[PDB]
Curated annotation (Swiss-Prot), chain A:
Gene Ontology terms describing biological process: 2-oxoglutarate metabolic process; female gonad development; glutathione metabolic process; glyoxylate cycle; isocitrate metabolic process; NADP metabolic process; NADPH regeneration; regulation of phospholipid biosynthetic process
Protein name from the UniProt record: Isocitrate dehydrogenase [NADP] cytoplasmic
Keyword Zinc-finger: no
Modified residues (N6-succinyllysine): 118, 368
Organism: Homo sapiens
Domain of life (superkingdom): Eukaryota
SS bonds (residue pairs): none
UniProt-annotated site: Critical for catalysis, residues: 197
Positions of Mn(2+) binding: 237
Record-linked PANTHER family: ISOCITRATE DEHYDROGENASE [NADP] CYTOPLASMIC, NADP-SPECIFIC ISOCITRATE DEHYDROGENASE
């Protein structure tokens, strides 16, 4: 078996919990041995430990660089009542993000037989108050050296009351955004585009464009030209214009079962992968009632494969990297071959025309991925 | 022999929308409706010659006669000033007319049963003071009452690490009240429910002000009439609102904090004044193809529906059931004509995919307008 390494695993809730254990059992463990740092982020254990499993998991990701997370219930009122929660805990994704930092990149997985060639990887990057009555709401900046004092008028209230707010943004955040954007662009080998309003908010987004150019020229221009890739700034409307008439395959800096979300830290060494969808509670209820479900596992599978690909990149693990690539291959090939779940069958033929004989249920699709994975790993090597 | 329309303010535009405009009137509106027409030529040449005075006059005429219908007008930039030898770079007519009439903009997409996906109407409530921070310092925001009361200073941020950027935003109470009013007026006009989505938790005081004002206006004015129509209002949050929206049959008005089918309507808070216009521009590419003598295929549905929304509002005001039925008949003739298979190149592309658009799949502009004239005559003959 392949020697994997140190990987932080986080288990989730409901249907994604089931698919998680299936993915490991039938796809991961039979071929890879891992120094696994498992953390049970189910809602009942998060309640029992008072989100301490969440904090611990986040710090463990900070130590071992690579994390793979399953979808976990985010509690609201009906959740607190359902599980008898001691408190309405904050989102574990929120906690982990507030401990690790970084920027989130969402990539959709494109099959050549599903209605939509190269995927677009989209990455996204305050004092409010009431104002009782008429008056002057100004915003003033005073440098630390006291050289000047600049005061702008947000609005002069003469009609009556209202509401106001002020926002800020330091340079280091924009520099981290550009860092992770260029690193992701070089890791995938696809060009990078930055889209902003830039004209409406003249001063605000122009800073983003400028910092992106400074970092690109002082660090990445050479390596980009050395990989048939580049960076370029555009505006939102023109970005949609060229986008709706392009082959695809670029990092744009601004069925759900196929969306993959990955948090990339600015230092470039720490990465957390997770499906972009939720716990699929409706299908989990169908599973509780003994009915037949059909949940696409591709998003969580790709969380595992991207996490393993990053672990392999860190450990110089050629075998494990080949394994992750092989599993992604088996997935896209299995769907393109015709075997898929009901959601993809609906994306193709439209819901009211979906016959049963057009899709497989969750366990059948997992079995098919297992067969094709064993075949692929035996023949491709 | 023709329907008595009423007082309507017309605004003429530029280029391809100008051509399609004259086609819509000549072949669809005038043969069946007589109007006390307040025409205003908002073309770039007349706006230049009169020094944008025709824009102010047209806006004031809409404020007086309640119903306005506008054609797409060029908003001039540098290449426009260079093209027309403009004396000045005039402001956007939508900007002027909107700053004189107030109100809230509602955009509705027209859904055909053969178009890649009940319609959803989205009304939107810009002036933000942003600046760059060069180095360390204190960025504060201060409110000072008019009655000489103590001034309250909040710290937006203290920069000690280095530079950055900052900005400030505001919103008066009257603006939020106009937004909620126009939202309720549109909700009762369409008979669909109304939803308000905000970041009520992150911006507690800011969006909480919106939620509160919306609820207060709902209770001390409406709610009774909503219950009198099997409809309601409800505040929600962004993500759950997208959840309910993206998984419903459609048919609700969402208040937020293909272009040939998009219709834009400015609704004033008073509920009487309404200005309708297509959500697209003057279609310069098609107008240049039209100048060179080439064959164009520009969808007129958006402008036609501008006319039908304006006329339907005029009929609703004057209690003109005949004119209201005419507007409904024209809307239905449009959607039915497209669903019958006759359409323009953009819709043919939405159906058959762009690289596979064969000519025999669409009609040119004049052919499609002729078809709408035929089907309008037939339907109005059957009624
Ligand atoms: N990191 C996390 O733990 C995390 C992040 C996101 C969401 N969530 C949690 O998920 C819970 C419920 O989420 P939700 O109600 O919004 O549903 P969801 O999981 O976000 O997805 C909603 C829809 O996705 C569809 N779906 C079908 N197959 C799927 C597949 N293989 N993968 C993903 N989605 C599939 C279902 O459509 P059908 O109607 O046809 O069944 C379902 O209605 C929430 O408590 C939320 O906190 C967890
Ligand atoms: N913001 C506005 O919409 C607005 C408001 C009032 C007046 N105007 C004025 O109208 C004038 C003409 O500008 P405009 O052509 O942009 O008006 P427009 O009405 O917004 O034009 C839309 C057109 O853009 C074209 N297009 C070309 N490539 C595209 C792509 N990759 N993605 C999406 N659409 C694409 C389409 O025509 P094809 O079928 O040929 O591709 C489409 O009909 C301007 O001077 C403007 O000031 C515009
Ligand atoms: C899908 N998804 C997110 O993208 C996410 C991130 C996030 C980060 C911070 C935060 O405050 N929230 C909102 C929240 C507040 C309190 C309790 C629970 C959630 C959410 N949480 C989830 S579920
Ligand atoms: C497409 N499109 C609009 O939808 C639009 C609306 C609008 C409404 C209010 C307003 O104050 N402005 C500001 C403005 C003033 C002068 C020139 C340009 C913009 C613009 N202006 C345009 S061009």
């Amino acid at each position: 078996k392949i020697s994997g390494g140190s990987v932080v695993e986080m288990q989730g809730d409901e249907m994604t919990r089931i698919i998680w254990e299936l993915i490991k059992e039938k796809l991961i463990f039979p071929y890879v041995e891992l120094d696994l740092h498992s953390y049970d982020l189910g809602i009942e254990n998060r309640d029992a430990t008072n989100d301490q499993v969440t904090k611990d998991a986040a710090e463990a990701i900070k130590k071992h660089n690579v994390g793979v997370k399953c979808a976990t219930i985010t509690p609201d009122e009906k959740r607190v009542e359902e599980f008898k929660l001691k408190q309405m805990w904050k989102s574990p994704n929120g906690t982990i993000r507030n401990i690790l930092g970084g920027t989130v990149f969402r990539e959709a997985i494109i099959c050549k037989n599903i209605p939509r060639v190269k995927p677009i990887i989209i990455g996204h990057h305050a004092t409010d108050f009431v104002v009782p009555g008429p008056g002057k709401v100004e915003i003033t900046y005073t440098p630390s050296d006291g050289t000047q004092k600049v005061t702008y008028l947000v609005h002069n209230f003469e009609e009556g009351g209202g509401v106001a707010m002020g926002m800020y943004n330091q340079d280091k955040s924009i520099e981290d955004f550009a860092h992770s954007s260029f690193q992701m662009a070089l890791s995938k080998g696809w060009p990078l585009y930055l889209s902003t309003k830039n004209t409406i908010l003249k001063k605000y987004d122009g800073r983003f464009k400028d910092i992106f150019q400074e970092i690109y020229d002082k660090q990445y221009k050479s390596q980009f030209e050395a990989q048939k890739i580049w960076y370029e700034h555009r505006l939102i409307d023109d970005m949609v214009a060229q986008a709706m008439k392009s082959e695809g395959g670029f990092i744009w800096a601004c069925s759900l079962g196929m969306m993959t979300s990955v948090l990339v830290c600015p230092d470039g060494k720490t990465v957390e992968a997770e499906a972009a969808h939720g716990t699929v509670t409706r299908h989990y209820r169908m599973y509780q009632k003994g009915q037949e479900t059909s949940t696409n596992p591709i998003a969580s599978i790709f969380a595992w494969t991207r996490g393993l690909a990053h672990r392999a990149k860190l450990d110089n693990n050629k075998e494990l990297a080949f394994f992750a690539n092989a599993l992604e291959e088996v997935s896209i090939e299995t769907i393109e071959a015709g075997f898929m779940t009901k959601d993809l069958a609906a994306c193709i033929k439209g819901l009211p025309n979906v016959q049963r004989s057009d899709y497989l249920n969750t366990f059948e699709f997992m079995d098919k991925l297992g067969e094709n994975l064993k075949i692929k790993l035996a023949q491709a090597k």
